[PDB]
Amino acid sequence: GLPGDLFGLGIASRIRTDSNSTAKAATDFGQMVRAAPEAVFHPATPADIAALVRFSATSAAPFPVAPRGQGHSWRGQALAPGGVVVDMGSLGRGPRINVSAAAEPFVDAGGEQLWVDVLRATLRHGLAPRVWTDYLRLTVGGTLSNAGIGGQAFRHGPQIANVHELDVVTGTGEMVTCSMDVNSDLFMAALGGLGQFGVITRARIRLEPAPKRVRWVRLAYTDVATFTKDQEFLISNRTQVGFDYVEGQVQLNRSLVEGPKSTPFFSGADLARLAGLASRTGPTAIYYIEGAMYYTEDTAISVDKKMKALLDQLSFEPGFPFTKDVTFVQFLDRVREEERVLRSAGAWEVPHPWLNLFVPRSRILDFDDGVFKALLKDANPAGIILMYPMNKDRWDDRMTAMTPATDDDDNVFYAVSFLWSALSADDVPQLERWNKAVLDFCDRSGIECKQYLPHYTSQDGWRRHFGAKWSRIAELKARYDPRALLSPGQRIFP
Ligand SMILES: *Cc1cc2c(cc1C)nc1c(=O)[nH]c(=O)nc-1n2C[C@H](O)[C@H](O)[C@H](O)COP(=O)(O)OP(=O)(O)OC[C@H]1O[C@@H](n2cnc3c(N)ncnc32)[C@H](O)[C@@H]1O
Ligand SMILES: NC(=O)c1ccccc1NC(=O)Nc1cc(Cl)cc(Cl)c1
């Protein structure tokens, strides 16, 4: 498929066209889409990626180029059929993480670097990035191409709001350093850019002093209105003396009754006590607020009084607070333990038809009514459902990443993640029907359900997703990837 002229050049020494190489680059975490590339590119340096992109961009037959991080995509976004998959991990040679601890401390990290490896390096200097995804085995460039949301995003914004600068290889093959003050149009496009404007090869990440330990809590609710009121109180300016991390989970009645006998967080005794709570008024769903209070040797003496003062302000079910006290690393890397349990049960390397939505606060109770109370009330899917609010004023609307736009008056929106697993491959159509039912319900009810980690097969879906930002995106695309070579699996510019 690829031009014959490629194989006579220097870049071809880092090309692998064998079946074993291309098959590894053919699938992703979702395990639903298979499309092998013509070749895998193993760059030594980011300059090699630039030479590959320039060659394609100036070629008589331009081929697609897709950077692949950890392949933690589920809709074939990192796939390049008819083209080349760039193994980003190949750049991991020599020092690829540089901390400047000396004004404000920062960490320079290769786009291929795992957040887990960034954390290890910054902790040696007692520093850490401020915002984390729940899963640390994801690349820096991979999460920054989306936004990177987690429990600290309500305070500091997404990971894209915690970046000082980027090194980007554009779709023309040009290596550009960009920030808020230099090449700012490229900087803004790339953050939440879905790899459409260039490959992130470096990110300068914002740092803060690292905590020592975490007081980690889970608070159970049966009433969604009380649960949402408390989450909104917890992310508000009122609560300087609150949690550093705020998340939430939705547990359907059957997933607790017919689910595992214990989990890494909950003991068998905890789950039986929760089974009683969930059956109290017939079968009902449990909503959990998950909070975390960071502390060091200096704040260790006031943390117990701080936790008591905060919890006394909340309205979780009496007798249903759950507490852990762990190191900062144990907390940030908590999902490693969950993956370990899933892997031993053969429940990890299975299909993941995942759906992530951004729902305006004004419609969160209507969303809950049609989705958890009507659609999923008697459903028993494997996996987890996340639900937590965020603050719009911590997001930069000049960046590509989309937040809901219907309520300009309202600073709050909710992230709702349907992280289901098909324990049997033939369960995929059932989870895909649930995905479609939630989206159809949003359209039918007039709920502005903006996708996070979006996927659309046609440009009409993407135009609806980008809304008032679409013309700016199309213009930026013509400027930075005119031949539409980059990350074609996104299916925005076919
Ligand atoms: C698998 C998974 C994902 C995940 C998560 C937990 C798990 C188990 N938890 C998340 C969380 O708490 N918060 C959040 O914001 N996202 C979370 N995710 C999703 C994940 O961040 C994204 O899927 C993201 O893409 C990271 O994935 P990864 O590093 O594995 O990248 P990929 O799958 O190979 O590629 C994704 C797309 O981005 C393009 N790409 C990849 N690297 C780059 C660079 N350096 N520059 C530009 N574009 C890049 C790919 O081509 C593809 O289109
Ligand atoms: N408890 C967890 O959050 C979890 C447990 C097992 C495997 C993954 C986990 N977390 C996870 O996938 N979080 C996530 C995943 C995505 Cl795609 C998007 C967002 Cl907002 C959050």
Dist. CA 494–CA 490, nearest whole Å: 9
**CA-wise closest residue to 252 among 102, 385, 403, 397:** 385
490 lines ligand 2 (CB under 6 A): no
**Angle, CA of 209, 148 and 326, to the nearest 5°:** 45
Dist. CA 441–CA 449, nearest whole Å: 10
**CB proximity list for 196: less than 8 A, separation 6 or greater:** 189, 400, 473, 476, 477, 480, 481, 486, 487, 490, 492, 493
Straight-line distance from the first to the last Cα atom of the chain, in angstroms, rounded to the nearest whole number: 18
**CA-wise closest residue to 163 among 182, 187, 183, 186:** 187
Bridge partner list, 159: none
Buried-state track 275-290, b at ≥16 Cβ within 10 A, e below 16: eebbeeeeebbbbbbb
Decide the pairing of beta strands 163-170 and 198-209: antiparallel
187 and 253 share a domain? no
201 and 273 share a domain? no
- Cα of 87 vs centre of ligand 1, distance in Å, is 14
Q: Which residue among 250, 356, 417 is best mutated to probe the pocket of ligand 2, counting the most ligand atoms within 8 A of its Cβ? A: 417
Q: Read off φ and ψ for residue 228, nearest 5 degrees.
A: -70, -40
Task: Put residue 359 in one of left, alpha, beta given phi > 0 → left and psi -120 to 50 → alpha.
Answer: beta
Residue in 28, 38, 48, 72 annotated catalytic: 72
Q: Is 369 a catalytic residue?
A: no
**CA-wise closest residue to 450 among 494, 381, 392:** 392
**CB proximity list for 122: less than 8 A, separation 6 or greater:** 99, 107, 128, 129, 207, 210
329 and 429 share a domain? yes
- Cα of 176 vs centre of ligand 2, distance in Å, is 32
170 and 28 share a domain? no
Residue in 134, 185, 366, 432 annotated catalytic: 134
**CB proximity list for 340: less than 8 A, separation 6 or greater:** none
- PDB experimental method: X-ray
Q: Which atom of ligand 2 is nearest to the CA of 149?
A: 20
Determine the 3-state secondary structure of 287 from DSSP. Answer: strand
As given in the structure block, the two tokens for residue 486 are 């980059």
DSSP state of 67: E
386 lines ligand 2 (CB under 6 A): yes
Length of the chain (residues):
494
Does some domain include residue 463?
A: no
149 lines ligand 2 (CB under 6 A): yes
Residue 73 has a CB neighbour count (10 Å cut-off) of 25
**CA-wise closest residue to 360 among 442, 448, 467:** 448
Q: Is 432 a catalytic residue?
A: no
Amino acid letter, residue 222: T
CATH of the domain at 149: 3.30.465.10
Bridge partner list, 359: 414
Question: Of the bound ligands, which one is closest to the alpha carbon of residue 489?
Answer: 1
- Domain end call among 209, 238, 262: 209
Dist. CA 127–CA 98, nearest whole Å: 12
Most distant CA atoms of the chain, gap in Å: 72
Question: Of the bound ligands, which one is closest to the alpha carbon of residue 71?
Answer: 1
Residue 295 half-sphere exposure, CB side, CA atoms within 13 Å?
Answer: 21
Does some domain include residue 466?
A: no
Q: Which domain holds residue 169?
A: 97-209
Q: What is the resolution in angstroms?
A: 1.9
Given a contact cutoff of 8 angstroms between Cβ atoms, the answer to whether 227 and 311 are in contact is: no
Q: Is 258 a catalytic residue?
A: no
- Domain end call among 209, 226, 254: 209
Number of domains in the chain: 3
- Cα of 410 vs centre of ligand 1, distance in Å, is 29
| Concatenated DSSP letters of 101-137 | -----EEEEETT-BHHHHHHHHHTTTEEES---S-SS
